[PDB]
């Protein structure tokens, strides 16, 4: 539950009926943030401020949406919601909010002309709340499908899933995931729980298929997602926020196989507390950023 | 002049009151892409897909925008745009144009409180044709200062500018470039044409005063060049890639300082999927470096 950390609030936007949405979670105290960029199909947006060699901003929320490319337009919704409420760098002329965004695809299940807007984007942050949130087909993992292998028709639910890894001393590591992989999502057994189905309902075993030959069918593919947020109450520097983002991805390739394929636009952003008393290690950080990325992955599809 | 290279038309969208606008430049025939951010203080959209270890998208257009962070809804307004007009990578329920884009700061000459949106993104697009295009300010340099340091009472106008250079053989690199930066611009002489003044008028050239202790009192502090180069060979995303890199040498050539902590300078690179020119990269880079920096004139030379 990444309203477990100082600070964060977690709003939802969900469409029901076109099956897309759009999740923001906003820091109502300031964070040093960093990101992975894993995937080869990503589309994001204010990723470059994010990097440890980049000035540090202020980042307001960042978003986890759908809609594909188009739904980047429910981040700027996001960030003119925080410049009216006043939040944001100050200039003395304005205020300039940050609200980084990476997206899924998500236009196959529902209605394809339907996506984040700027209205939605604004949606989400007036739902924002401190507390618990609701997980599944909720937000940005309204329209999410998992195992793709052999098209939308033949995948299995995704959706949206948290968990919070407790460590000692008081410190915590949270996890927010949106799950619309192209792969299979396995337990810690390495049994199937989501995954690409044969027409009947049994699971295929997408990487065993695809070692015998069957081809990729899912929309993206004549081109050549699993996004999410790990947040700790550490105080971090940018360069060990980016450093727990790229570890995080260790826990998407435990639990999703194949992972980080060229379908697949996999995105972790990272936060840690400007202001906090509380350190440790940032690799003890990111293998706890792993293991709740992990939990989180399984949580999204058991809600 | 960017539209010497096939395929490429200009448009631009001004506002001259509020001092800022956008400028778009959209690929008639496809184009390999790449992408170098190199400035500290970098606002952008959709570069992921301009890396080499991406998948080779298929790119509508390019931006380049004033209206910092807001100013990045204008490339969802040219994405809107492009997909009424049926263009985009084609999913079957529906096509997905892609628009990448990087932004300048202009809020602090003009009016801050009107930045590019969805509308006038549409509009670049609605005025986007070949041949030779208008420089200066108009477009995304409509609102352009150079030469910071004092802040923005005692900058130069900036703007934006093309050039062409021609190697053997038809081969040709063009640049079109926004010149917002923090540092002073100097010609080939290394003279200043362009950059901070002293109160009693004469330039007063940034990095001495820097070296001698002057303190960065430009808006961003407390915490841009922008453009695209374009070539008629074809080349693969690596290559590409390598010459968006290249070409940030000539503006080290042009502008100093650069690169700076409030400075989000990205220079985009395209080269042609189909085309039967080839070239060594590193003589095109070398190219792209020179088109750049002659760019960079052009914006104060109108
Ligand atoms: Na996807
Ligand atoms: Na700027």
Redesign the pocket.
């Known amino acids: 539950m990444l309203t477990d950390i100082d600070g964060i609030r977690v709003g939802h936007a969900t469409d029901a009926r076109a099956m897309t949405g759009c999740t923001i979670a906003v820091f109502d105290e300031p964070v040093v943030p960093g990101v992975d960029v894993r995937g080869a199909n990503a589309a994001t947006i204010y990723t470059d401020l994010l990097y440890p060699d980049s000035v540090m901003p202020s980042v307001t929320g960042i978003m986890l949406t759908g809609g594909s490319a188009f739904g980047l337009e429910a981040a700027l919704g996001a960030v003119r919601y925080f410049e009216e409420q006043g939040r944001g760098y100050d200039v003395g002329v304005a205020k300039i909010p940050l609200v980084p965004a990476a997206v ?2 998500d236009l196959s299940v529902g209605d394809a002309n339907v996506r984040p807007d700027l209205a939605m984007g604004r949606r989400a942050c007036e739902a924002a709340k401190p507390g618990p949130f609701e997980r599944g087909r909720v937000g940005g993992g309204t329209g999410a499908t998992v195992g793709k292998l052999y098209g939308v028709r033949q995948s299995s639910p995704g959706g949206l899933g948290t968990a919070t890894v407790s460590l000692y001393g008081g410190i915590k590591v949270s996890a927010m995931i949106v799950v ?1 992989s192209f792969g299979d999502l396995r337990d810690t057994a390495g049994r199937i729980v989501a995954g690409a189905k044969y027409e009947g309902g049994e699971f295929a075993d997408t990487y065993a298929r695809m070692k015998l030959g069957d081809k990729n069918q899912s929309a993206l593919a004549r081109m050549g ?1 699993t996004i999410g947020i790990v947040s700790t109450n550490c105080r971090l520097t940018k360069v060990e926020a980016s450093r727990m983002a790229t570890l995080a991805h260790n826990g998407l390739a435990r639990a999703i196989c194949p992972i980080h394929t060229n379908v697949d ?1 996999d995105t972790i952003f990272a936060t840690g507390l400007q202001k906090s008393d509380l350190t440790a290690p940032v690799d003890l950080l990111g293998t706890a950023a792993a293991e709740a990325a992990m939990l989180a992955c399984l949580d999204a599809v058991m809600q």
Do not use: K, L, Q
């Open positions: 899924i695809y619309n997602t636009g």
